[PDB]
From a paper:
[name] (IR) is a receptor tyrosine kinase that plays critical roles in cellular signaling, growth, and metabolism. IR can be activated by two highly related ligands – insulin and insulin-like growth factor 2 ([name]). Consequently, IR-B has an additional 12 amino acids at the C-terminal helix of the alpha subunit (α-CT), while IR-A lacks this segment. Here, we present cryo-EM structures of full-length human long isoform IR (IR-B) in both the inactive and [name]-bound active states, and short isoform IR (IR-A) in the [name]-bound active state.
To reveal the mechanism underlying [name]-dependent IR activation, we determined the cryo-EM structures of full-length human IR-A and IR-B in the presence of saturated [name]. We expressed and purified the full-length of human IR-A and IR-B with a kinase-dead mutation from HEK293F cells. The 3D reconstruction of class 1 (determined at 3.6 Å resolution for IR-A/[name], comprising 16% of the particles; 3.7 Å resolution for IR-B/[name], comprising 14% of the particles) exhibited a T-shaped symmetric conformation with four [name] molecules bound at the canonical site-1 and site-2. Our cryo-EM analysis shows that, even at saturated [name] concentrations, only about 16% of IR-A particles and 14% of IR-B particles adopt the symmetric T-shaped conformation with four [name] molecules bound, while most particles are trapped in asymmetric conformations with two or three [name] molecules bound. Structural comparison between IR-A/[name] and IR-B/[name] complexes indicates that the site-1 and site-2 binding modes of [name] in IR-A and IR-B are identical. In addition, the 12-residue extension in the C-terminus of α-CT, the unique structural element that only exists in IR-B, was not resolved in the cryo-EM map of IR-B/[name] complex, suggesting that this structural element is not involved in the ligand binding or stabilizing the active conformation of IR. The site-1 binding of [name] is mainly mediated by the interaction between A- and B-domains of [name] and L1/α-CT and FnIII-1 domains of IR in a fashion similar to the site-1 insulin binding. In addition to these interfaces, the C-loop of [name] also makes weak contacts with the CR, L2 and α-CT’ domains of IR. In contrast, the site-1b interaction in the structure of IR/[name] complex is mostly driven by the salt-bridge formed between Glu12 of [name] and Arg539 of IR. The buried surface of [name] binding at IR FnIII-1 domain (424 Å2) is considerably smaller than that of site-2 insulin binding (681 Å2), indicating that [name] engages site-2 with much lower affinity than site-2 insulin binding.
Author numbering:
A (entry chain D), D (entry chain F): 6 to 32, 37 to 63
B (entry chain B), C (entry chain A): 1 to 161, 168 to 518, 528 to 541, 545 to 573, 577 to 656, 691 to 718, 766 to 919
E (entry chain C), F (entry chain E): 8 to 29, 43 to 62
The structure:
């Protein structure tokens, strides 16, 4: 099942939860979130990798 | 009768009439006749030439710029049947740029076996609309007759008719060839077998015309075959069919083949024998046998190759395709381009469809009438050795009516090299193209912008995603709609659903008037909310065809539509019966007429009508009608799409940037049933009536009735109702005061307003006096005063509503002198 | 006042408010501020946080899903100016998915230097329509505010206003930030220099707000630059501009460069000095000097290469293009895709246009607001080393508004490899594409179906073949058209001309309502016949814009059009003056009103109006008004194209096959000029008038006048006109017959119909008698008979058309007892 | 100058004149007359070569 | 359409469920059936 | 449009040249100015 904008944030903070999303610096790759979960189906691990501590 | 004369195989005459003498002895033509390119000719040079011997043309007749020719009634007085074996651009009789022609004159033409007729750009020819092509051809709609004298001018079609006439669209019209002859029309029992002048049916084998009815020996043209005059349906051995019109002995075909063999004519064919037919060459699977002329089946699957000049051949007409008839393997490439307007599926399937493999590419460009590519019945392999420029093997361009490409349930296909190419096929859809790609096996042989998504099927509802309706129910006046939700993989692409609805009289309606309404896309339920919609305004008790189509932005398109569902709304009350008119013919008979309401809104069960009695006007009793002045009545869009796409793309950019992955008064009435009129009886004389007219279209489940309609009806009076009856008694007082007694007409014409008493003595004059209602009541009649002595003759006139009644008989009373 | 506090370069706060304490000492931000992704927050946790120190934001402010935030009036009470050096998707203030927000609260925002504001999808925010973005931004039309609480709901905008108000479209409205504060609006003399609360203008350098007017030392934000509080327009040496908002000593820039050099931060820039500016890197033509930090011009033409990640970069926003600012040679490929609706030419030209060579390909897809590609000011060479898939170097797809590609009077271009590609550019035309091909030099590098003929310019009249008009002249009512003939190389392709005409009020009308009419193509003259056409029906004296466009079948298209020529027809007669109403207020004054005719059809020179005298009705003299009943009045197409093409192709086939190569009543009137009304004087009392009203719109060249309008006007009577004057003389005969003498009112109110004579004796009663016109004429007055002895008091009442006149004074006459 | 159907016949019999147009037999090449004079400009000799005797 | 008459639409889209009054969304705006279905609550 | 009234169109399209009568081409058909210009002959 593919999920896109609007509901993507709703899915986040539920799969991630408690802890937020990390941020170091801008350091465009153009593979960020939309062409990972909206354009193509994405699994739980690809959402978990956007968490902060784990 | 037989055909006495040389068969004289088809030829053409040009540049002088001195070449027209080759037809001096010609009963039939085994070929085509072309008379064209005549400039230095005059009508004075045409009065002499005549060919009564010519009967039947095998291929076609073409006339092109023959100056000085005014009518063919002297050239071909006996052209009966044109066989049309091979046509001239799918036409069997072409008359083009025919200057100086006035009338066709082919008053002997009966039947054209195969082909059509194209006559145009004559600028002088009339007597065309006075003909019946239905009895001449077999496909009238394939004709082409424009730009003649008939349309832009008004050449009078004066002809006998006397001569038979027939209907065409909605009226009869005489069918005449020339000013002296007319098309022979006879009963339909002889569909094509022919019929004599009297009306006797000719022989069944016979065709067009015959001399002795029911006698093949005395016919002029027989449909099946010909042999020794007395033609038969199929001649027995040792006679083999020849050129599909006659048969001859084996010696004839053998010597003809020998003549073509020894004389190396470039156009001669090595005629063979195959199933009692001296055909030019038998099809694939047979080999020419040196010993005997027939071609026995071979012990090997060798197809009949079909070599093409310069590796190309354009198919734009029936005669273009006929050159490939019997061919099965093409040693070249085919480009199909049929600029038409009339479908050619039948003839293409007859000529093509026996081909299996194409060495080169197959190209279909600008073809219009082609509704499908099914005429390639046995097309299996496209080798594509001679690849099209741009490295393609299949082409498609500006096909306005290419609906279906092939039936993939049974058909097979194979493409070796090259790639497909489709562009501007509004009736062809990407599903069929992708099925082509899958079946062919060239899936990995595709690139961008070879199959345009926005051109193929742009006006064909073929997204092939079905939508159901959850529940609907229609009430007395309106209807509610609801259907299951739909969501593309990216839900932001759904901009809402289109709703289509229209009134469908009968059960069938064309798919994609058609009023539409925008629908707001439903909120993301993530329990699911059915979108639904409510209609606004409709005509009750009508069949409505509704269907909903999704509208999704182009990014792959994943729209959806629903089936055409017909919903029947309910009936309502009718309107006022149109034109309520009431008339009276007899003292008690009043006839009232009406029309059904403009919108019945229901099956009119009955009409509820009431007639009511009224009293005389109150002010009439209190009005005096002897005072002077006594006149008593004689009673635009892309911006929204881009706004949505721009919102979506900004949201996508924000998501990309932010997130980073980790490292009732009983008036008498009657129910008028199945009648727009009513006759009522039993009415008082000279009495008006108030008529309350109303209609109902429903009786058993409560009377659903319309509003009342009020009309006025007045009856005529009786004959002697206003005349005063009873003796005219008078009381005389001491002052000679005459107090008149008379009984009033208890049943008058409405009401008597006044009386006119005229008493005259012998030698005296006539006097008058008004007796009003109050005068007749308070005084109990009249009261005369001051009468001269003598006997007076009294006549009394009663004045009623209708008018003045008849005078009473002269009454004589004598007062003392 | 100065900025006391750390500059604290821009940062973002996420996932907890405990990170929001870094702004404890921050007067300015040298960067961007982002507060986003707040979920486990409540409004009770926001009442404490406040940052009065924050004044100016350099880049932008973004808020994205900060739960529990209801108003920013407590967060940023002193945000004055947002510099907007670098934007977030061409936006300077983004408020997105801002749940729980009620009011903006930025009651201290004054000026945003560069960018726009996009607020959407808050679902709770109101107090938006009560703001004036014109005084805040510089380009209001670039804003984007939708899907808030304001539209779908009705959040009441209750606020003081007291507070200033201004017009927006056609009405005034108060401009308030919150329920307690409102936007500060002060006279336009201080365009942006700022102004105190009273109204005194601040210093010219100053911006937004100031404490002491006309004093740069006591300002809060100055537009030009900043230095040591007392900011100046441009600080002198040894201070160099820094980040376009402030300047510092050379030591600061030098140590910052040293810090970036020794500390290998991936984001640090080796800051240099170039024209008193500590910029991150000076442009092409300068080299970093180890000794001193400024970059001296080099002795060699070395451009500033611009290396691109993965050889690609999509330009969809201002911030996307800003990364290439100062770059001149691209080591990759550019794909431009601006999903917009607002043109970005200015900012694209500011950031791009300094690039010269492109190593790879340049691709323009789906861009909408791009009206031209002129922003590539210095684009010279397209190397095309990294060729696009399909071997292309230039791309074009779904450009809805690509009008002009480049100006080829001056511009130059060069393409090394690859081929062009254009598709679906309805505003781009094949002439510009062929000029592309000629100037570039890739003429022999083109194939079929790379530049579609039927998609580019399909809705843009650009066939660039002019058509003249031979002669035209307009008459009183209609107009005749005629133009020079036109013929494509194959004359059969001309199906006729399209004629476009419409009424143009002013001299300018848009090119390609617009009623059209079909034209039959002219006959082949081979003397030449001008086609011409005649119009049918029009509105006279109106400016008409006409132009003719040829319609030629697509086989190359060689159509032609004419210039938009404006033709003025003539004027005609006017209509009846609307609403003709006449009223009377004085005995001789009658006021008549009218409106100009619905279609004046000409400048109304004058109004010709006639008032006529009438006589009393003839039947009135012959009617008696004492009889009972004396009520005296108180006075679809493709088929035709294919038919043409099919005719042409059959003619071509015939030609191919046949030919083979060898081996007045002066009623008073007045010309009412420049007036829709008239007042007339000198009218007889109680006398009607027939008014004939008509209008003319032309006087000197014959009176072009309209039809007459008839209205009726009646004047009121005088005061004592109906009273009988003169002595009431009476003649007494032997029979005591009283013959009354009285002089009639020679000037009555119309006419006196009857008289009422009332003579009463002492103790007797009043008698009455009718004196009709015939009675007054034949008897020469009244004639009384049978009067009782005694003196009678006689009062006479004259009955006129107006009514009963005043009774005459009691006249006493004594007859013998 | 290019000439096409309709007027092509009118031009013929005037450039050719007197003598007609030769005809031996059908013996389609698809370079007959239309793509010689209508599609592309054609000179006098290309019309003269369609005469009979010369 | 406005009050009194508009009740037929609510009874149409809600049936035997009843509704609470509020016409300001149909007299000036357009009835889109989205507000009508949520006007009546079970 | 028909006879009598139609004369204005002929004088419009021919000016001071005059014309011969014949309305059968405009009462039932459409006036296309092609017949009108050739109706009047010099």
């Amino acid at each position: 099942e593919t999920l896109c904008g609007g509901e993507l944030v709703d899915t986040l903070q539920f799969v991630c939860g408690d802890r937020g999303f990390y941020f170091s610096r801008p350091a465009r790759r153009s593979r960020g979130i939309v062409e990972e979960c909206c354009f193509r189906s994405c699994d739980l691990a690809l959402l978990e990798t956007y968490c902060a501590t784990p | 009768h037989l055909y006495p004369g040389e068969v004289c195989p088809g030829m053409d005459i040009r540049n002088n009439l001195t070449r027209l003498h080759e037809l001096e002895n010609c009963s039939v033509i085994e070929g085509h006749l072309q008379i064209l390119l005549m400039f230095k000719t005059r009508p004075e040079d045409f009065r002499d030439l005549s060919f009564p011997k010519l009967i039947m043309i095998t291929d076609y007749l073409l006339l092109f710029r023959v100056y000085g020719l005014e009518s063919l009634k002297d050239l071909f007085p006996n052209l009966t049947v044109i066989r049309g074996s091979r046509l001239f651009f799918n036409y069997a009789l072409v008359i083009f740029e025919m200057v100086h022609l006035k009338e066709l004159g082919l008053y002997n033409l009966m039947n054209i076996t195969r082909g059509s007729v194209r006559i145009e750009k004559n600028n002088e020819l009339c007597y065309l609309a006075t003909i019946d092509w239905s009895r001449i051809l077999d496909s009238v709609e394939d004709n082409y007759i424009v730009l003649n004298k008939d349309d832009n001018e008004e050449c009078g079609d004066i002809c006998p008719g006397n001569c038979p006439a027939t209907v065409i669209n909605g009226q009869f019209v005489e069918r005449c060839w020339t000013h002296s002859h007319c098309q022979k029309v006879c009963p339909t029992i002889c569909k094509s077998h022919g019929c004599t002048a009297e009306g006797l049916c000719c022989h069944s084998e016979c065709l067009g015309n015959c001399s002795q009815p029911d006698d093949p020996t005395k016919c002029v043209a027989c449909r099946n075959f010909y042999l020794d005059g007395r033609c038969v349906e199929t001649c027995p051995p040792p006679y083999y069919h020849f050129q599909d019109w006659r048969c001859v002995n084996f010696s004839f075909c053998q010597d003809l083949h020998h003549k073509c063999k020894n004389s190396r004519r470039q156009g001669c064919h090595q005629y063979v024998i195959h199933n009692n037919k001296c055909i030019p060459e038998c099809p694939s699977g047979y080999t020419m046998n040196s010993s005997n002329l027939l071609c026995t089946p071979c012990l090997g699957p060798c197809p009949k190759v079909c070599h093409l000049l310069e590796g190309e051949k354009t198919i734009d007409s029936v005669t273009s395709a006929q050159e490939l008839r019997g061919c099965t393997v093409i040693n070249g490439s085919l480009i199909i381009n049929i600029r038409g307007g009339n479908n050619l599926a039948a003839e293409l399937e007859a000529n093509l469809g026996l081909i299996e493999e194409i060495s080169g590419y197959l190209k279909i460009r600008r073809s219009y009438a082609l509704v499908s590519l099914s005429f390639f019945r046995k097309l299996r392999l496209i080798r594509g050795e001679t690849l099209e420029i741009g490295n393609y093997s299949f082409y498609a361009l500006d096909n306005q009516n290419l609906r279906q490409l092939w039936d993939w349930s049974k058909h097979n296909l194979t493409i070796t090299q090259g790639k497909l190419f489709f562009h501007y096929n509004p009736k062809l859809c990407l599903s069929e193209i992708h099925k082509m790609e899958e079946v062919s096996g060239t899936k990995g042989r595709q690139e961008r912008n070879d199959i345009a998504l926005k051109t193929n099927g742009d006006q064909a509802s073929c997204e092939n995603e079905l939508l159901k309706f959850s529940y609907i129910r229609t009430s007395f006046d309106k209807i509610l709609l609801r259907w299951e939700p739909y969501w593309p993989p990216d839900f932001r692409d759904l901009l809402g659903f289109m709703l289509f609805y229209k009134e469908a009289p009968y059960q069938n309606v064309t798919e994609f008037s058609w009023t539409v309404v925008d629908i707001d896309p439903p909120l993301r339920s993530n329990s699911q909310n059915h979108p639904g919609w409510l209609m606004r305004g409709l005509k009750p008790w009508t069949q409505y065809a509704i269907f909903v189509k999704t509208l999704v932005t182009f990014s792959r398109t994943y729209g959806a539509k629903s089936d055409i569902i017909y919903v029947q709304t309910d009936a309502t009350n009718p309107s006022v019966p149109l034109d309520p008119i009431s008339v009276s013919n007899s003292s008690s008979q009043i006839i009232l007429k009406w029309k059904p309401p403009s919108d019945p809104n229901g099956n009119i069960t009955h009409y509820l009508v009431f007639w009511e009695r009224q009293a005389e006007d109150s002010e009439l009793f209190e009005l005096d009608y002897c005072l002077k002045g006594l006149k008593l009545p004689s009673r635009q869009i892309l911006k929204e799409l881009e706004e949505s796409s721009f919102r979506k793309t900004f949201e996508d950019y924000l998501h990309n940037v932010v997130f980073v992955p980790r490292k009732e008064e009983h008036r008498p009435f009657e129910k008028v049933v199945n009648k727009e009129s009513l006759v009522i009886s039993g009415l008082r004389h000279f009495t008006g009536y108030r008529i309350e007219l109303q209609a109902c279209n429903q009786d058993t489940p409560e009377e659903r009735c319309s509003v009342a309609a009020y009309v006025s009806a007045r009856t005529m009076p009786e004959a002697k109702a206003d005349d005063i009856v009873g003796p005219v008694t008078h009381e005389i007082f001491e002052n000679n005061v005459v107090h008149l007694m008379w009984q009033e007409p208890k049943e008058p014409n409405g009401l008597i307003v006044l009386y006119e008493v005229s008493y005259r003595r012998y030698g005296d004059e006539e006097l008058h006096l008004c007796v009003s209602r109050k005068h007749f009541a308070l005084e109990r009649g009249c009261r005369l005063r001051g009468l001269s002595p003598g006997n007076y003759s009294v006549r009394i006139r009663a004045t009623s509503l209708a008018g003045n009644g008849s005078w009473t008989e002269p009454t004589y009373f004598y007062v003392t002198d």
